[PDB]
Amino acid sequence: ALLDNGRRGRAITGSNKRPLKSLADMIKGKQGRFRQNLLGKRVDYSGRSVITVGPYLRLHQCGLPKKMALELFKPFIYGKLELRGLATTIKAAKKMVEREEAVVWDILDEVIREHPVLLNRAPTLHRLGIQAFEPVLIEGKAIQLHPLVCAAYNADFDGDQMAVHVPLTLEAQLEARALMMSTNNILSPANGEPIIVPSQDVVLGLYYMTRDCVNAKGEGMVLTGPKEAERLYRSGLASLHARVKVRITEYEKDANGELVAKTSLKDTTVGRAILWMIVPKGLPYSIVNQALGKKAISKMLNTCYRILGLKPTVIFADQIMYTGFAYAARSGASVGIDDMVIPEKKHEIISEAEAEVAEIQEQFQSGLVTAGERYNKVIDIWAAANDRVSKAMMDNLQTETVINRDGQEEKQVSFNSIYMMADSGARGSAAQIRQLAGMRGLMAKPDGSIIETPITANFREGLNVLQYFISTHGARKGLADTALKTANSGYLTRRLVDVAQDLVV
Amino acid sequence: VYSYTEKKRIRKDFGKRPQVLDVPYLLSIQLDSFQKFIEQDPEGQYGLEAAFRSVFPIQSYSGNSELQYVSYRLGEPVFDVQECQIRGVTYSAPLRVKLRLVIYEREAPEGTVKDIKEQEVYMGEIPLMTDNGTFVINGTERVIVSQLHRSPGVFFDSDKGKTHSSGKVLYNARIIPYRGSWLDFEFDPKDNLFVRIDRRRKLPATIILRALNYTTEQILDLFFEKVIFEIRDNKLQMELVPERLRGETASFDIEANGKVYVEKGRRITARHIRQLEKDDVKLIEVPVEYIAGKVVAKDYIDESTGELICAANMELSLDLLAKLSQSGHKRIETLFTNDLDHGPYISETLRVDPTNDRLSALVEIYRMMRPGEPPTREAAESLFENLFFSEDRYDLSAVGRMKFNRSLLREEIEGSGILSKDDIIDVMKKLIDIRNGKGEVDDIDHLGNRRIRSVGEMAENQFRVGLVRVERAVKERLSLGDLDTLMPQDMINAKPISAAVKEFFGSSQLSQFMDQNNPLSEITHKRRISALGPGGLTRERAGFEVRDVHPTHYGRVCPIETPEGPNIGLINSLSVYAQTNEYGFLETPYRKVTDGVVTDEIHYLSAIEEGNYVIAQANSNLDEEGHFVEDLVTCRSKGESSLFSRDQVDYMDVSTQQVVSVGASLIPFLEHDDANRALMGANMQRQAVPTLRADKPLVGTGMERAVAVDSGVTAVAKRGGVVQYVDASRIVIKVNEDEMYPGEAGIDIYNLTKYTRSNQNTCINQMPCVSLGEPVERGDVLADGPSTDLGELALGQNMRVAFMPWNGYNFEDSILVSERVVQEDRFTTIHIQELACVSRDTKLGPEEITADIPNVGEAALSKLDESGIVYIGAEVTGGDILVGKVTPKGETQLTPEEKLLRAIFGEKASDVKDSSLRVPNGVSGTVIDVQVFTRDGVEKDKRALEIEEMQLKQAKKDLSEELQILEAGLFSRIRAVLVAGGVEAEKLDKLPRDRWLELGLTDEEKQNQLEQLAEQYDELKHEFEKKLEAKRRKITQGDDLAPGVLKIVKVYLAVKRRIQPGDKMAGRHGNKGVISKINPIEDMPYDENGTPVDIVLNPLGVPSRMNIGQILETHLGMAAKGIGDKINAMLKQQQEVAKLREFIQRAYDLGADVRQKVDLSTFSDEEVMRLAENLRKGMPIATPVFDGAKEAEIKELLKLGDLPTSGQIRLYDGRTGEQFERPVTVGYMYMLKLNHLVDDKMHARSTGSYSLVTQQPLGGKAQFGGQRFGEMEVWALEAYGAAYTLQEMLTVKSDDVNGRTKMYKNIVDGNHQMEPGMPESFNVLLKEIRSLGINIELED
Amino acid sequence: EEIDTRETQDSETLDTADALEQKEMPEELPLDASWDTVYQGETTQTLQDYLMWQVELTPFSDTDRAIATSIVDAVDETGYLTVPLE
C-alpha cells in the first residue's frame, strides 16, 4: 500500500472513502511531477486580462495598461531610480514606487521604450499563438490588440483573455525582436500564404469604395491625378462611384532592378484613383481597377510581398487597414428588415411541389408503388423545389434597375447591404442568405434520416412551433459534436508531436 | 377589469390566440414534493410514515421483547427564516416519535403481554423548506436539484452488432429495483443464455432455474412443447398436426387415406397445410430415419430390465428405437422445434450447464458471489434467499412493480415488492420471444422510461438509511437482559439519523448554493433537472445519444435551454406547463376535441399515453363556437407530424409557449432567431447584474409579471386594505373588516430588506411602490425587489442604438458606448463584501478585541470606537484597521533588558502582540454593517449592546402599533357605555382617557360592564407585556460557536462599479460583446434634430448569426418610443384629458384582431392622468414567443407615431458634420450587463510567494500567483527556435532558487544576464524515485 | 477502510483512431489544457529574510557580505543583536 496503493487488490481509503495517494501517485499521472511541474510550470513576470481592439495601433505595437506594467517591470524601475540619484537605497525606491509618485511614471515610460513583451492566447495550437509586441502604455484595465493579428490568435472581442510575459536577458529580448516579432511572422508556416490579411469591416470598406454606378454625380470628367479626385470627393462635387478618366503614372521594375515610369490616361472611378495613393511604387495599376473583395486584397498583398519585400508589405497592410476602416465608416452601411427581399414566386413553387406530393401520395394509395420509392420521390420533389426557390431569390437579389444618362433603363449590380456583405466576402455566404430569405429546407432526425416535409419558412417571416422543434435536433447535435471533437483533436496533435519531437535540420 | 398594480401601467399585447389555461405557479415541483415528505400520511406509502413502517417493529433474536412505532410529530422552529439568516444557523424543526417497548413472558401461548412502556423520544432536527422552495443551512439559502433517472423494472435491449465482427445482435434483459441487486439475462453468439448478478462473472441460465428447485423435465415442459409419437405396430404411425409443418420440407413420402399429399423432395406450403387441415389428416406413416435427430423430453425405463433407456433432453438413434420398441413403450415424447421460430436455446444451455441438481447450484452461486472460502449448504441457501426474496434487502417499489407488470402485459398494477419464480420465468420467456423474432426492444431515452425524483424522495431515502443503522444498534443493544428498567429513550441514540440528514442537506452533490444574480436565476435554478448525481450518469460515461432532443420532450423538457460544454444535454429545464404523475413521470395538458368541436376540458397526458392519439397544433384557426376552420389540420400522431382530417383529431395544444421554458419564453421574436443563438441568449439572460434603477423592457412577451411575482423577491399583499403607513423601510396596511378575524387588530406589517449581501456579492434592496392612503387588494405588489419595476422583471436598460461601422471600434463584436451613458449611471452596480475577525482562546490566555494597540500610531486608531471596531460609514482602503485585536506572547523571562523596556514603555507593550483585521490590499469601500457573535457566558461589549438595543426598538415599535389600536377600541367602548348613564359630555372628554377608569355609576349593569372592561384592559396590557418579554428573551440569547472560539466580528463593505472598456454586455438574442471605447458626446452620430445615439453596433454580426429578432426588436422599440414621445409632448403643453385619452385609446386599439381589449371610458380622470404619466417614456409592448407581432403591425405603429416605415433615418457625423451616404437603422434595444467585470480579471505579478515542496509560484489571483506556461507554449517556443527564452522561462522564473536571487540582483544592477542552475522539481523527482527503492543518480 | 478496485485504467496504448471512434468523453484531457480552452504550504518572509534581501541589494564586498551575513544570523525576532561583536 505504501509503494503503490490500489494496484494489488483493495485500496486503503481515508475517512471520506478516498484512496490514499502513494509514491507512485506522486510520480505518475496527469497530476504527477512530469506533467505538472517539469514539462510545464507557473512563472514570474506574467499577467493576464481581457482584450479589446485598438484600430490606431501599428502592426508591431500593443496596448498595455500602465497599472499592469508598473507591477511587471518593478526591478527595472528600482534600478533606474537608483541610477539617477532619486533613491539612495533600495528601500527608498521601494517606498517611492509604493506611493506612486509622478516621477516613477516617467521612469516607467523610459524603461519600456524598446522592450518587447510576449502575448499568448490559449489554447496554443501552432506557434503563432505566442507573439511579441512593443508596449504602449494606456489608461484602463484591458489589453488592446491589433485587428490584423486576431486571425492568427483565433481571437474575438467578446470576453477572451490573454497572458503577457516579459523577457529578461539580452538574448531573450533579441530573440523576441528577431524571431517572434509580429512584423516577421507575416507568412503562414503551414502553407506560405499571408496570414495578416484584412477581413470584415476593412474588406467591406475597400469593396464599397471601388465599385461603380451607372449615373453618378460628376460622371465623365477628366482629372489630372488622384489628388484632384480626392479634392472633388471631399468637396461634394463628385461621387465615389463616378466613372471618369484619370492620368496615372505607374512604375515597373527593370531587368537590372531599376524602376521605369510610364504615364497614361485610364478609365476608372474616383474611389479607385483615391485608393491608388497608398500603393507602393513597383505595382501595376490593374491591381486596383476593379471591385476588391477578400481574394483580391489577399492577392494584392501577396504580389506586394513577392515583388518588393517585407517592410513595404507591412506599411501597405497598415495603410489598407486605415483606409478600409475610414471608408466603411463613411459609407453608412446598415442592416434592415427590408433588405431580406423575398421572391414573389415562392408560393407558386411551394404550391406546385405540394400538388406533386399529393398526386404521388394518391398514386401510392392506389397501390401502384411501394413505400421507399414514394419516400425517395417526395425527397427529390422537395429538393428540386428548394433549388428553384433558391435560384429565384438569388436572381431577384443580385440586380437592380437604374436610370441611364440619356434617360434609359439599365440593369446593374445591386447595392443591397446583405448582397454587398456576401459578395465582397466580408461576412456570410449563400446558404445563410437562403435561410434568411428563401427557405430553411429539409431537416434530419437524430439518427440521420431525412424528414419528408421540409421547413418552407425563412427567418424573416418566422417559424412555427413544429418547425422550430424540428430544427432543435440538428442544432443540438452539431453543438454536442463540436464540444466533443476537440478532446480527440488534442490526442492527434499530442501524438504527432511525440513521434517527431527530435527531428532537426 | 385590471388590478391596481396593473392599471398603473398597461402593456399593449399583440397576441391573437385566446388563453384557456393560466400559467401555473412556477415553484410547485419543490413545494409539493416537500409537502409529501413532511405531511401526515394515514397509509405508509409516502414520507416519514413510510420510512418508519419500513423498519419497525424491531424484534430481538430471543423474541421476548420488541419496540413498536406509534406516531411522530414536528415541533415549532426556535427561530424564523430571517432570524436564522442573521444568526447563521439552520432553519429546522425537532422530531418527536412515540415508541412503545413491550416485553413477552416465556412458556405461554403466542406472546404474553408481560409489560408495556410508552415514551416520546427525540430523533433530531429536520430542515424545513421556506415559502420560496429553499433551505436555510448555516444561514445560507440552498437549492436541491431534481434528478432524472431510470425507472425501476425490467428493460430489454440489444447492442447493434458492434461488439462482434460478424454483425450479430446480442439481446439482453435487465431487472433493476428501487433498492437491491440487479439481475441480467443475456444471449451469446452461440445462442446460449447466461445470467449475471451485480455485474459479475457470467454464469449459465440453468443455474438460477436449478436454484429454484426445478427439474429438467419441468424446465423442458415450461419452455419447449411436446410431441407424442405413437407405436401402432407398423413403423411408428404418427398423429400429425399440420401447423407444425409450416416453413419446412418433407424428407419422406407423406400419405393418408391412399392420397399422397406431400411427396419426398416436395416442401410443405400453405396450400398443403390448408388441405391437410380440411381433410383432417392425422395418421401419418414415417420411416425410422425420421427420428434420427429428434430430442427426447423425459426419461423412459424398461419395465422388464428395470434400468433406464435414456435420459432427459437427449437425441435418439435407430438402436434406441429398437430398444424402446421391445420395451413396450407405445408413446415417445419429443420437443417440437424448428429453425425459424421455436429455436432451441434452453436445451443447449442445459447441456453446457455443469450442474444437474439443486444443492450444487447454490454452491456455485455462492462461489460466484463469494469466492475464496469453503462453501456451506446453509450459507448458500441463506445468501440466495436474501438476495431477491427478502423484504429487507430487495424492494421493487410501486412504480417498479407497475412498470414490471406493464412490460409483461399483466392485468394487475399492484403487487409484491420482491421477485418470484413466475416473474423470472416470464422475463426469460419474453427475452426468448424477442430472440425468436416477435416483439421489440425498449427505448431507454423515451421519457416514459425515465423518472423524476425530487427532494422529498431523497430526504426519505437518507432518513431510512440513518434509521436502519439506528435499528441495527438497537438490535445489538437489546439482546441483553435489563427489560425491567430499560426505556426507549436509553435504547436509541439520535446522532446517526441527524448526522445523515445534515450530510444530505449540506454536502450532497445535488444540494447547491442558490444562484442569486437576479430573480430569473433563482427561478431557473429551482426548476432544473439533472441526469447526474448518486444513481445517475457521469459526463465521461454518459454517451452521445442521451444528450439529444427526443420527440417525447415536446411539452415536458425545453429543447433550447441547456448548458454548452461538457454538460450539454445532461442538465435540462422544465417547460412552462409540465407536471409529474403520482409515479414521477412528466405530463402535459391538452384540450379535448369532441366531434370536431374543441372543448375547454383539460387532460394531462404522459409520454406513453400521448402517442396513442392524434394531437393538433395550437396554430389552428377556430370559429366562434369552437369549430376547425379548415378540414386538413397538421397533427402529431406517433412521433411524426402530417395532415389529418377534421374528425380524426383527439386533442389540441393549450398554448403556443407550451414547448419552451421560462427563460426561453422571455425572448421576444424568438421565432426569427436561430436555435444556437437562442440557446446562448437564454444562458446569458440569467447572469445579468441589477443596476441602481430598474427599467422595464419596453418590448416584452407578457411573462415578466409572473416571474417577478412567483420568485418571491417582491412584497405581495396578504390581505386587502388601505396603506396606513409607508416609509423607505416598512409598510403598514390597515386590513379591511370583512377579511379580518374576530378579536384582533387588523394590521399587516411588512419590513423591507435594505442593502443586503447576496451569494454572488451583489446588492439586495427593496423599495416601496405604493403611496400613503391608497387601496390595495390581496396579491398586489407593495415593494419592488432587485431587477423589478412596478411588479415586472427588469433585467437591463433601454438603449438608443444604431447599426453601422464606426472607424474600427466595433470590429469583431466590440461595442462603442457614449459618454452620456456613463454620466447617467445607467449601468452602475453595487457590490457588498464580508470580512471576519475571530478571537479564540489559547493556552497562554485569551485574545482580546481592544482599541489599545501598543504599536500603532494615533492616526491609525481614529476610525475605531471604544470597543476597537470601526465606525459605521467609514471610508476605508487597503491597509486600514477594521477590528483591533491583540494576542498574548507568552511569559518571557524577566531579563534586565526586558525590565528596562517594561519600565520605560509600559507593561501592555511587553505582554501582547498585534493580530488585528486589516483591509486587504486593493480593496476599498464604505462600512455599512457590523455584526458581533459572542459565546454564552462571555461578557458583551458596548457595540453588541448597541446592536441589541437597535433590534429591540423595532419589536417594541410593532407591538406598540398593535396595542394602540386595541386600546383605542377598548376606550371607545368605555366611552360609549359611559354615554348611556351619567354622560358628562364635555366633562368626559376634557380629561384624558385613563381618567375615565376612575369613575362610579349606579348599581345597575353599568358597574358590572365597567368592571369587565377594566379587567379586559388589564388582561390586554399583561398579554402585550408577555409578548415584549418573550421578544427580548429571544433577541438577547447567546450564540453557539465552534470550540475554542470566543468572539466573531463581521464587517460589510459596499462599493460602486461603473462601466468601462473591457466590460461585457449582451442582448436577449445571443448578441454579446465587450466595450472598446467610451466616446465623448459630440463625436457620436446624430439625426436631424440633433439627438445622438447611445450605442453603435456592427451590422456585420447579424447576417452570419441569423438572429433576426434583434432587428425587429429595434424597429418595435423605435415605434414604442415614438408613441411615448407623442404622449410626453402632449403632457408638456398642458392639454385636455379628453385628447390624451383619445390618443391613448387609438394606441391601444391598434392591431389585427388582437385578443386584448382596453376601454378607457371606465377610467376616471385621475387614473387616466396617472397612466399617461407612466407612459411618457415609451409604451410597453408584449409579443408572445410564437404569437407575436407582424411587420405590418409594426409599420402601422410606426405610422401612428409619425416615424419612417422602413425604420431607417439619416445620420450626421459628429466629428465633421457630414451626412452618412446611406440610411441607418436606429432604434431601441434592451441591453444587459453581465457578471464578467474587468476589475475581477486584471492581474499581474513580478515576484511573490512560492510552494513549499516544488518551490514554484502559486496559482490564482487570490494568491497573487503567476501564469502557467504549459507544454503547448513550450512547443511554440521550440518551433520558433528561441532557446534562451525557454531556458529563462524554465529556471530563473519558476524554481531555480539561487538563479532567481541572482537574476533579481543583476536586473537591479543593470546587467541583463542569468546564471541558470538545476530546477528544484527535478531534485524532488530524484528523491521520490529513490524512495521507491530504485537507484537513479546523476553521472559525472 | 479498504475497498476493492478493479476498474480498468486507460493508458497511452489506446490508438488515435479509437479515440475518435468512442462516443464517450475522456476522463482527463490528454492536451495540456483545462475544460475551457494533496496540499502544500507556501513560503513566508520573516525579518531575517527581509534583512538578507536588503543585504543582497547593497554594494558590499565579499568580506563585508560575509560579515553582514554573520550579523544578520545573530539577530533575534525583537530586532536586537544577541551576541557581542567579538
Ligand SMILES: [Mg+2]
Ligand atoms: Mg470569444
